[PDB]
């Protein structure tokens, strides 16, 4: 039984991971229909920044050699015309590099070996010209998607293992994966958006959380644990830059456990050494990125290391509130001082956009960039619909019950005022995970989209309802505990089956022909070295297919491109034609492609381009909006009023392409 339990736990973890991979892959097939799409229609399926991330994978695989392709990526001069930029540490294209590296030798071996991994046949689209859709592993899109979905199918395994650790019985793991299965829609969105960066990084983040909980629970330490923690901290950092701010709310959770005497000395030293080494490697591999420093993840590492190493000097402290307050003051002061001693100090000037969109939520401070990000419906507060949906499946009531039980037990089994430094308080992993859930819940409530962190911790905490130590003990008896742990599971299936039904009975639309016709015109009637500017969503699609140099892309936060977006969107302002034409010529563009509904004013006011260009351009207020000129020029089919601009392309009054003289 000591081994039949472990084998069963491992096997069930692998099985739940495989089931999750199959579920995501099926949902993706239902949503997009890659089965019967030509290799140029899947690219059009990849929307705004998913196209930017897949185009570099396509660049590397198509290049004559891996080294020359990666060299072209690191010395890229077409993503932002006018500069040579490094797109590897700027966009975090490490998944693309790894996948392309694995694909090139694999395809080369398959081709020579006579293996037919790609089989496809002509598919007739009807009115439009028939195309050829290919399937199989040898297809680039399926290699990319299989990699993404294989990595994202282990989130279920990590959640099952975390449920088993934080409750110490298989029924807890079942509760956690069943809470994940029934709230799959509200916990992840990889099935629609494979190429996004969080799809590659979150599996490693939650795997790191699992390994950290295992290390804390069993008082582990040594070099093996350092290797284990580093192997998950490095890839999560190379992928998704915002990984860093996750690993900062993890440190704030370890501190609050260490300060309560729930983590030994040697274990804490192992943890912090692993963080230091992983940061050093991640900073080295990202070409010495200066945004790595001046974040909250480096100062946090240093502050926690200092608090850990000045811990033995405070053994004689007996009054717990004073000890906790002193450590908290030291931690906060060191973090704030180091962050401001490099941002405002050595002259690194970390971007202040994350603080700029938080100060707009509560304040009236608008700015063009905040309205560009806040009105996205994805950086707004969490909608009440999400809360009602999560309460409908009984994931929030169950997590809330478990949280109350843990708090009551912790208060009734601890000495709150007086501390002994020679004894470890026990149940440190549970407190780590509860504090983690409370930092994930505040982030998810402020900026929607960050519920990918919130929901899996709700599941992990709900798994805490099967802890025999809490919510009873040896008095409950085995028969009664098991009888109430299948009743809960039966009531989770009752309210969770319909969720899976409504999630499997949804199918997506069959694209739109307007974009394909526009790209056909771009390919036929435009020279290969033309430079395009336009609204950010369309630029990444123009670059992915049509291979044209561009001047602005959807991943615009980094310096030197946060200023091109205002110039580009000045076309929708009330500036004179001469001003906009001079701006566009100076940037060196030839064509400007946009959509007629971009100039369509009501929706919610102060979330349309016309309203935005009245809050930061009061001097130009009262002038005829440039958009009216565009619409009249499109309608009348004459370049009369717009002096130096030509309406080079106008089909079915959706996409308009202006030519810069």
């Amino acid at each position, epitope marked *: 039984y000591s081994q039949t339990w472990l084998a069963s736990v491992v096997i069930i973890g692998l099985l739940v991971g495989y089931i999750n991979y199959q579920h995501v892959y099926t949902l993706f097939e239902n949503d997009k229909h890659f089965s019967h799409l030509a290799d140029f229609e899947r690219e059009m399926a990849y929307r705004t920044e998913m196209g930017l991330y897949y185009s570099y994978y396509k660049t590397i695989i198509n290049a004559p050699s891996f080294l020359e392709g990666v060299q072209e990526i690191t010395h890229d001069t077409v993503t932002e015309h006018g500069h040579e930029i490094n797109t590897l540490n700027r966009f975090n294209l490490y998944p693309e590099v790894i996948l392309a590296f694995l694909y090139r030798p694999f395809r080369a071996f398959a081709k020579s070996a006579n293996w037919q991994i790609e089989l496809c046949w002509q598919v007739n689209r009807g009115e439009l010209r028939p195309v050829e859709s290919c399937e199989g592993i040898g297809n680039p899109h399926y290699f990319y998607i299989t990699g993404v979905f294989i990595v994202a199918g282990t989130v279920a395994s990590s959640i099952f293992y975390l449920g088993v650790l934080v409750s110490d019985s298989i029924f807890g793991g079942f509760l956690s994966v069943l809470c994940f299965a029934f709230n799959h829609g509200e916990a992840t969105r990889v099935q629609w958006t494979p190429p996004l960066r969080e799809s590659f990084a979150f599996p490693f983040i939650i795997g790191h959380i699992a390994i950290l909980t295992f290390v804390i629970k069993y008082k582990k330490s040594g070099h093996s644990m350092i290797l284990l923690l580093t192997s998950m901290a490095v890839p999560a950092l190379l992928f998704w830059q915002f990984t860093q701010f996750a690993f900062f709310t993890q440190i704030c959770s370890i501190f609050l456990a260490f300060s309560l005497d729930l983590i030994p000395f040697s274990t804490a030293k192992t943890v912090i050494h692993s963080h230091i080494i992983s940061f050093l490697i991640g900073f080295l591999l990202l070409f010495g990125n200066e945004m790595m420093i001046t974040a909250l993840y480096f100062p946090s590492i240093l502050a926690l290391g200092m608090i850990i190493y000045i811990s033995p000097l405070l*053994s*004689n*402290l*007996k*009054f717990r509130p*004073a000890y906790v307050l002193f450590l908290a003051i030291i931690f906060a002061s060191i973090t704030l001082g180091l962050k401001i001693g490099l941002s405002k100090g050595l002259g690194i000037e970390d971007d202040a956009h994350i603080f700029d969109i938080l100060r707009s939520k509560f304040t009236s401070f608008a700015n063009f960039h905040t309205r560009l990000y806040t009105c996205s419906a994805e950086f707004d507060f969490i909608q009440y619909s999400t809360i009602e949906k999560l309460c409908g499946t009984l994931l929030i009531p169950l997590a809330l019950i478990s949280l109350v039980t843990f708090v009551f037990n912790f208060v009734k089994n601890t*000495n709150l*005022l*007086w501390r*002994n430094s*020679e*004894e470890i308080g026990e149940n440190g992993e549970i407190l780590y995970n509860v504090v983690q859930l409370c930092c994930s819940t505040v982030m998810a409530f402020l900026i929607m989209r960050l519920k990918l962190f919130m929901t899996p911790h709700l599941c992990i905490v709900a798994a805490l309802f099967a802890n025999s130590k809490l919510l009873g003990g040896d008095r409950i008896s085995k028969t009664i505990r098991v009888s109430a742990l299948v009743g809960v599971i039966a009531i989770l299936f009752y309210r969770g089956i319909p969720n899976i039904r409504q999630q499997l009975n949804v199918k997506g639309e069959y694209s739109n022909p307007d974009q394909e016709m526009l790209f056909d015109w771009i390919q036929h009637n435009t020279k290969q070295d033309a430079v395009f500017a336009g609204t950010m969503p369309v630029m990444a699609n123009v670059k992915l297919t049509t291979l044209r140099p561009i001047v602005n892309h959807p991943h615009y936060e980094h310096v030197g491109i946060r200023e091109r977006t205002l110039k580009v969107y000045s076309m929708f302002s009330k500036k004179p034609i001469a001003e906009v034409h001079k701006i566009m010529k100076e940037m060196g563009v030839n064509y400007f492609v946009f959509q007629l509904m971009n100039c369509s004013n009501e929706r919610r006011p102060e979330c349309v381009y016309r309203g935005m260009w009245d809050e930061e351009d009061p001097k130009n207020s009262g002038r005829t909006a440039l958009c009216d000129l565009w619409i009249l020029a499109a309608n009348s089919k004459d370049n009369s009023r717009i002096a130096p601009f030509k309406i080079v392309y106008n089909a079915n009054r959706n996409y308009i392409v202006l030519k810069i003289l």
Partner: antibody, heavy 125, light 108 residues
Framework: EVQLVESGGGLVQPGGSLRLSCAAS????????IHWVRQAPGKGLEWVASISSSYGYTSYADSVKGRFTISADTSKNTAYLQMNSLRAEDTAVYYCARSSSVYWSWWGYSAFDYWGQGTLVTVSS | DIQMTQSPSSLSASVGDRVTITCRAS??????VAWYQQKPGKAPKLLIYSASSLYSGVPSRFSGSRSGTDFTLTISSLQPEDFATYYC?????????FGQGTKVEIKR
């Protein structure tokens, strides 16, 4: 000079109530904690209750928890112990001792350097 | 929750004899221990605090020591007025616990 003086003892029928006073001369209360200690006839010393008057923090011995109430008013520089539902085992001599404030505890309470003269309370039906 | 246990529950010695009383703490109060003496019918009087620091105004023949969780009170030159009951205290937790006591009488 600094000194503690106890008063208000005597005889009480079992199950009754008794309020006993500790007056401090010299040092100003609310700058320190004051504790009550029991000497039962022929037994050792036992700790009863503690009060820090600056922010009104009180602590009790698990035996007397829910029966005793320790309250200090800085106006007259005095502390009071109101003890109800006296059993037959509460007959003893009560001492008032001075220690450091709980907020400045930090490495634990200081030793009781100044003690009262003791007040005898006898519970007998 | 923390218990102080004094070993020699009764000690008998005559003047001029070294005397040692020992206290054992179940937990690990670091050095918050104190030693009092009480003569019959009168309140205690602090002798030692912190397990080593002689209180001001007491004769310097009393000494304190600590090793691990074993605390020791030592009297070098016993004198007629050094015949009382000696108590051990811990102040590192909330329930402040004394020791069961030791009585030093006249040997004969």
């Amino acid at each position: 000079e600094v000194q503690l003086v106890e008063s208000g003892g005597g005889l009480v029928q079992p199950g009754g109530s008794l309020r006993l006073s500790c007056a401090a001369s010299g040092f100003n209360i609310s700058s320190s904690s004051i504790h009550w200690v029991r000497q039962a006839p022929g037994k050792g010393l036992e700790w009863v209750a503690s009060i820090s008057s600056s922010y009104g923090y009180t602590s009790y011995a698990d035996s007397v928890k829910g029966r005793f109430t320790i309250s200090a008013d800085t106006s007259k520089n005095t502390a009071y112990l109101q003890m109800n539902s006296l059993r037959a085992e509460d007959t003893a001599v009560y001492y008032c001792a001075r220690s450091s404030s709980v907020y400045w505890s930090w490495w634990g309470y200081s030793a009781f350097d100044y003690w009262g003269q003791g007040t005898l309370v006898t519970v007998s039906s | 929750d923390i218990q102080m246990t004094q070993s020699p529950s009764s000690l008998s010695a005559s003047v001029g004899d070294r005397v040692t009383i020992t206290c054992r703490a179940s937990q690990s109060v670091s050095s918050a221990v104190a030693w009092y003496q009480q003569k019959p019918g009168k309140a205690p009087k602090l002798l030692i605090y912190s397990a080593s620091s002689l209180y001001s105004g007491v004769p310097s023949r009393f000494s304190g020591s600590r090793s691990g969780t074993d605390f020791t009170l030592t009297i070098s030159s016993l004198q007629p007025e050094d015949f009382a009951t000696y108590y051990c205290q811990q102040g590192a937790s909330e329930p402040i616990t004394f020791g069961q006591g030791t009585k030093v009488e006249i040997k004969r």
